Design a protein around this ligand. Structure first.
Ligand SMILES: [Cl-]
Ligand SMILES: [Cl-]
Ligand SMILES: [Cl-]
Ligand SMILES: [Cl-]
Ligand SMILES: [Cl-]
Ligand SMILES: [Cl-]
Ligand SMILES: [Cl-]
Ligand SMILES: [Cl-]
Ligand SMILES: [Cl-]
Ligand SMILES: [Cl-]
Ligand SMILES: [Cl-]
Ligand SMILES: [Cl-]
Ligand SMILES: [Cl-]
Ligand SMILES: [Cl-]
Ligand SMILES: [Cl-]
Ligand SMILES: [Cl-]
Ligand SMILES: [Cl-]
Ligand SMILES: [Cl-]
Ligand SMILES: [Cl-]
Ligand SMILES: [Cl-]
Ligand SMILES: [Cl-]
Ligand SMILES: [Cl-]
Ligand SMILES: [Cl-]
Ligand SMILES: [Cl-]
Ligand SMILES: [Cl-]
Ligand SMILES: [Cl-]
Ligand SMILES: [Cl-]
Ligand SMILES: [Cl-]
Ligand SMILES: [Cl-]
Ligand SMILES: [Cl-]
Ligand SMILES: [Cl-]
Ligand SMILES: [Cl-]
Ligand SMILES: [Cl-]
Ligand SMILES: [Cl-]
Ligand SMILES: [Cl-]
Ligand SMILES: [Cl-]
Ligand SMILES: [Cl-]
Ligand SMILES: [Cl-]
Ligand SMILES: [Cl-]
Ligand SMILES: [Cl-]
Ligand SMILES: [Cl-]
Ligand SMILES: [Cl-]
Ligand SMILES: [Cl-]
Ligand SMILES: [Cl-]
Ligand SMILES: [Fe+3]
Ligand SMILES: [Fe+3]
Ligand SMILES: [Fe+3]
Ligand SMILES: [Fe+3]
Ligand SMILES: [Fe+3]
Ligand SMILES: [Fe+3]
Ligand SMILES: [Fe+3]
Ligand SMILES: [Fe+3]
Ligand SMILES: [Fe+3]
Ligand SMILES: [Fe+3]
Ligand SMILES: [Fe+3]
Ligand SMILES: [Fe+3]
Ligand SMILES: [Fe+3]
Ligand SMILES: [Fe+3]
Ligand SMILES: [Fe+3]
Ligand SMILES: [Fe+3]
Ligand SMILES: [Fe+3]
Ligand SMILES: [Fe+3]
Ligand SMILES: [Fe+3]
Ligand SMILES: [Fe+3]
Ligand SMILES: [Fe+3]
Ligand SMILES: [Fe+3]
Ligand SMILES: [Mg+2]
Ligand SMILES: [Mg+2]
Ligand SMILES: [Mg+2]
Ligand SMILES: [Mg+2]
Ligand SMILES: [Mg+2]
Ligand SMILES: [Mg+2]
Ligand SMILES: [Mg+2]
Ligand SMILES: [Mg+2]
Ligand SMILES: [Mg+2]
Ligand SMILES: [Mg+2]
Ligand SMILES: [Mg+2]
Ligand SMILES: [Mg+2]
Ligand SMILES: [Mg+2]
Ligand SMILES: [Mg+2]
Ligand SMILES: [Mg+2]
Ligand SMILES: [Mg+2]
Ligand SMILES: [Mg+2]
Ligand SMILES: [Mg+2]
Ligand SMILES: [Mg+2]
Ligand SMILES: [Mg+2]
Ligand SMILES: [Mg+2]
Ligand SMILES: [Mg+2]
Ligand SMILES: [Mg+2]
Ligand SMILES: [Mg+2]
Ligand SMILES: [Mg+2]
Ligand SMILES: [Mg+2]
Ligand SMILES: [Mg+2]
Ligand SMILES: [Mg+2]
Ligand SMILES: [Mg+2]
Ligand SMILES: [Mg+2]
Ligand SMILES: [Mg+2]
Ligand SMILES: [Mg+2]
Ligand SMILES: [Mg+2]
Ligand SMILES: [Mg+2]
Ligand SMILES: [Mg+2]
Ligand SMILES: [Mg+2]
Ligand SMILES: [Mg+2]
Ligand SMILES: [Mg+2]
Ligand SMILES: [Mg+2]
Ligand SMILES: [Mg+2]
Ligand SMILES: [Mg+2]
Ligand SMILES: [Mg+2]
Ligand SMILES: [Mg+2]
Ligand SMILES: [Mg+2]
Ligand SMILES: [Mg+2]
Ligand SMILES: [Mg+2]
Ligand SMILES: [Mg+2]
Ligand SMILES: [Mg+2]
Ligand SMILES: [Mg+2]
Ligand SMILES: [Mg+2]
Ligand SMILES: [Mg+2]
Ligand SMILES: [Mg+2]
Ligand SMILES: [Mg+2]
Ligand SMILES: [Mg+2]
Ligand SMILES: [Mg+2]
Ligand SMILES: [Mg+2]
Ligand SMILES: [Mg+2]
Ligand SMILES: [Mg+2]
Ligand SMILES: [Mg+2]
Ligand SMILES: [Mg+2]
Ligand SMILES: [Mg+2]
Ligand SMILES: [Mg+2]
Lengths: 168, 168, 168, 168, 168, 168, 168
């Protein structure tokens, strides 16, 4: 009922993108626990973000089932980098990733609106759009502090951010 | 991202209006604790409403920060009256104030819809539009009871409403 | 009784100044939670100061009611700046604000003394004058530490002050 | 030390006035428990006020002892009325009594100031002057509500005030 | 019913005498806390007796109300002395006072008997006559011990009685 | 702000006097624990007074810091006596010391009043002037009892005062 | 018994030196709470050291009493500086002070040994000599860390030491 095939396909594309974001964050988590990086709270922060993105994917899979769509999985592409360079660079990449995921969600909302699917619009507004705004704000805050503190070249900056902001 | 400058400005106008509503309610609270009014539960009721309106303003300020807008504060105008005349008159003025704030919020929602900003639309629907409906209903209930009871001329009406309805 | 009209008017002016100080601190709080400032404990510190200044205003409104004066509210002017530049600059501005509020309170005390109003003199001494001294001392301490640490140009100074002194 | 004989005598006069105020309130308490008045919460309210005035007298007696003065007691005059007429009239008389006690305390403060006795000035400001302001405000509130409600001629007014405001 | 006007008047006289006894004991309490007397347990003992005498007065006022009499208050005369000389002398004066109050109560009982008022007779027997006997016995015990111990001239006597008997 | 250099200097003189009073009481405490005096509760009483005087000094040092004055310490002179002769003599000396400290505080209050420094006036009234009155009263009480009991020549007097009044 | 007059005098000199050390530390404590120093944990650290030195003085006074010597107090000289310059300088001065107190205690031990006073030797070894060693070690540790960190010129050094080492 009232579930357009274009919407089914776009949900499937969004599932893949959430799974990709999970993998990017998993890659970052294990970069920060290398013996030549060793920022354990950066590692834990990105591991938590990876697990949140898996939940984002699962909620969309549940939506497909609830609405009678067919889940169609695709390969989860590897992250663009295996070496994330620094805590600052990884935060900047995460910020760009979250902005790109947000744009995809806003395009999905525009499609649902065009198709007169208020249930899908509300689902996105309730579980996705504000979550993306808060995540982009948080990552922007982190980038700003790391830049101001002198990261990555100032030797104390990433260490102190790891211990204070990401320690909690 | 997807935050229109017209929306930024309208949010700033709404912040000011919420702060104005706070000040109106603060003025009313301290009118009801005058030695020649002395309706302590009217006073407490309006003081609580004043504090709620401050929270309404703060949430919009947080939204501006989250979305990357610039908060631009303006003078908070004094309330139209320093003498609120009676418990009935203050309730009628509060009802008109809340209706005017509601109209401003509905205009802000219409602008956000025109600009294709579902995050802002959802923010208003989630935190503002139903809150305004419930507040207008509550104040309308209070006005009706005070009118029926004979306020302000019937000497027992405002006293009994203060002790029973606004006592809790 | 023994409440001079000059004192009534000066109390009304002081109410407005306390409300203005509240607004200044509210503005500062939301500056520090911008995505390009992101000093969350500076933000919380100034938000708490804003709420304290509202209480200062309310106590003076209660005094007006208790003494039989008429509260006369005025517009609450916007703060002089929307961009507070740095944690150091905001602290320096808060220090100057508190010194100006203190001077106004001392002028109010001098007027109450001239009018032979010991109740008003005692009210100011009990709730205002020592509070102002302690606040000026605290803000002076903060300015000194931020200056010594190298704020705002030394990239670690404001971050470390935020995490250690204003974290608690 | 620094205790002027004029101050000793004025303290003794104030002790007598506090004891007189106690007796007035005791008289009122037992008027309201007459079988042809029967307002038990008016009775309890004035009995509590009577006991507070005894404490006011005792604190001044302690001050005389602490400062090395000699307590000189005088007759406690009977109250002006044995029939207090109504709840409204008794409240109006209590308001006038408290205003007269306040004027006496302000005259005592002026004398202590003239004699350069800051300890006595502070004693009065700490324990007496604000207490008098709050008591005058409270009694003024009660008078206003009783007048508005139609007391003493409106048969429900004093009964309802007794049950609601003075019940607590 | 069965309440004779002579009984009403005699109750009013007894109320005044109980209030007078309260004042005598209050005077004694504050004599013992002078810096040149400084017997703090004598002070506390007489303060407690003062408060008991107020209760004796209030019970008679309640009786007047219960029986439909009219309370008619009179001035409360000051105590005969402001300087009570010694702990022994104050105890001897209290003993004489209680004997005089007892004689007045026995005269009141004789009047109630003559008027055939068993309720008043029982009231006096239940709340007053045995209380007076016990108080006279207690004060006689105290006088005897103070005399035997050498008061007031033996420098340790009043001090030791204060610390042991009146300490508790 | 509003802190006169004469006031700064007078506060520094008062700090020294409080420290001197501490030292006097320390000397007395250790006199009473000599093997040829052996009044352990006199010793504890004066040791407690010594520690209170240190707190009096510290509060004035904090005030100097809070107001932006410069603490200027001076030598703490030794007490006038190393042999305090008796419990009575030590109490009489403490009484004279507290009277002299009180006179200095009243002179400091007069200076603060002349300089229009209500914060300093209130500080002294709140923390010092009543504390001095109560201390002078307490020591006067102790002197009176010791004199009446026959101290120092009556062999039981100081022993019994030590065990009863200063035991607690 | 076995208490040499040279030992009595040397104990009296040591009492004075302990009291002097207390005063030095008190001065330092209130330097660190100036509005232009504002290192609150340096302040608390030195205040605690001041109170420990008072206890050191009191134990020697108790020893004099226990052994039958006569306590002879002398003026407590003011500290050499009122401006302690920096956290590093104050620590260096405290280290030198503790070394000088230690030398005095070792000279006192040598005298007690020469006089064949094993009780005094044991008293010093039990309560003083190891305490001095530990205090000198602790202050040396603090000096070393402050020097290495760049104090006083490196703007973060004293602030970070205050928050981490002296915070606890
Ligand atoms: Cl499912
Ligand atoms: Cl695929
Ligand atoms: Cl790469
Ligand atoms: Cl990089
Ligand atoms: Cl880059
Ligand atoms: Cl770094
Ligand atoms: Cl925010
Ligand atoms: Cl404006
Ligand atoms: Cl108007
Ligand atoms: Cl109206
Ligand atoms: Cl109308
Ligand atoms: Cl009404
Ligand atoms: Cl009702
Ligand atoms: Cl109010
Ligand atoms: Cl205006
Ligand atoms: Cl600006
Ligand atoms: Cl700046
Ligand atoms: Cl600047
Ligand atoms: Cl910085
Ligand atoms: Cl007393
Ligand atoms: Cl008289
Ligand atoms: Cl009358
Ligand atoms: Cl009437
Ligand atoms: Cl009338
Ligand atoms: Cl009525
Ligand atoms: Cl009810
Ligand atoms: Cl009754
Ligand atoms: Cl009379
Ligand atoms: Cl007499
Ligand atoms: Cl006698
Ligand atoms: Cl006699
Ligand atoms: Cl005696
Ligand atoms: Cl301080
Ligand atoms: Cl000196
Ligand atoms: Cl001497
Ligand atoms: Cl002597
Ligand atoms: Cl003498
Ligand atoms: Cl003795
Ligand atoms: Cl000892
Ligand atoms: Cl000397
Ligand atoms: Cl120097
Ligand atoms: Cl230095
Ligand atoms: Cl150096
Ligand atoms: Cl440093
Ligand atoms: Fe999470
Ligand atoms: Fe996601
Ligand atoms: Fe995400
Ligand atoms: Fe609420
Ligand atoms: Fe609102
Ligand atoms: Fe509203
Ligand atoms: Fe009711
Ligand atoms: Fe606070
Ligand atoms: Fe304020
Ligand atoms: Fe302030
Ligand atoms: Fe009360
Ligand atoms: Fe009173
Ligand atoms: Fe009163
Ligand atoms: Fe009793
Ligand atoms: Fe009695
Ligand atoms: Fe009696
Ligand atoms: Fe104490
Ligand atoms: Fe003192
Ligand atoms: Fe003292
Ligand atoms: Fe310790
Ligand atoms: Fe030491
Ligand atoms: Fe030491
Ligand atoms: Mg997929
Ligand atoms: Mg997250
Ligand atoms: Mg590939
Ligand atoms: Mg690739
Ligand atoms: Mg919608
Ligand atoms: Mg919704
Ligand atoms: Mg939501
Ligand atoms: Mg969401
Ligand atoms: Mg997220
Ligand atoms: Mg951050
Ligand atoms: Mg605004
Ligand atoms: Mg509400
Ligand atoms: Mg206008
Ligand atoms: Mg207007
Ligand atoms: Mg909702
Ligand atoms: Mg809502
Ligand atoms: Mg509402
Ligand atoms: Mg209603
Ligand atoms: Mg205003
Ligand atoms: Mg504050
Ligand atoms: Mg303007
Ligand atoms: Mg402006
Ligand atoms: Mg105070
Ligand atoms: Mg204050
Ligand atoms: Mg403050
Ligand atoms: Mg600080
Ligand atoms: Mg009197
Ligand atoms: Mg009361
Ligand atoms: Mg008369
Ligand atoms: Mg009369
Ligand atoms: Mg004053
Ligand atoms: Mg005061
Ligand atoms: Mg007060
Ligand atoms: Mg008061
Ligand atoms: Mg009162
Ligand atoms: Mg009322
Ligand atoms: Mg009477
Ligand atoms: Mg008794
Ligand atoms: Mg007479
Ligand atoms: Mg007489
Ligand atoms: Mg019986
Ligand atoms: Mg009985
Ligand atoms: Mg009795
Ligand atoms: Mg006995
Ligand atoms: Mg000094
Ligand atoms: Mg004391
Ligand atoms: Mg000398
Ligand atoms: Mg000397
Ligand atoms: Mg006080
Ligand atoms: Mg005091
Ligand atoms: Mg004291
Ligand atoms: Mg005593
Ligand atoms: Mg010495
Ligand atoms: Mg130590
Ligand atoms: Mg010198
Ligand atoms: Mg020197
Ligand atoms: Mg050995
Ligand atoms: Mg050993
Ligand atoms: Mg050992
Ligand atoms: Mg040791
Ligand atoms: Mg040590
Ligand atoms: Mg260390």
């Amino acid at each position: 009922q009232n579930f357009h095939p274009d919407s089914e396909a776009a949900i499937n594309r969004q599932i893949n993108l959430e799974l990709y974001a999970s993998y990017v964050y998993l890659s970052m988590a294990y970069y920060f626990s290398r013996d030549d990086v060793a920022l354990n709270n950066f590692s834990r922060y990105f591991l938590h973000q990876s697990r949140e993105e898996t939940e984002h994917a699962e909620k969309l899979m549940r939506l497909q089932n609830q609405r009678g769509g067919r889940i169609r999985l695709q390969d989860i592409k590897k992250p663009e980098q295996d070496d994330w360079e620094s805590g600052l660079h990884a935060m900047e990449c995460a910020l760009l990733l979250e902005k790109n995921v947000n744009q995809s969600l806003l395009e999905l909302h525009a499609l649902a609106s065009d198709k007169g699917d208020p249930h899908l619009c509300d689902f996105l507004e309730t579980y996705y759009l504000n979550e993306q705004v808060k995540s982009i704000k948080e990552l922007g805050d982190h980038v700003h502090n790391l830049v101001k503190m002198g990261a990555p070249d100032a030797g104390l900056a990433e260490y102190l951010f790891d211990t204070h902001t990401l320690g909690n």
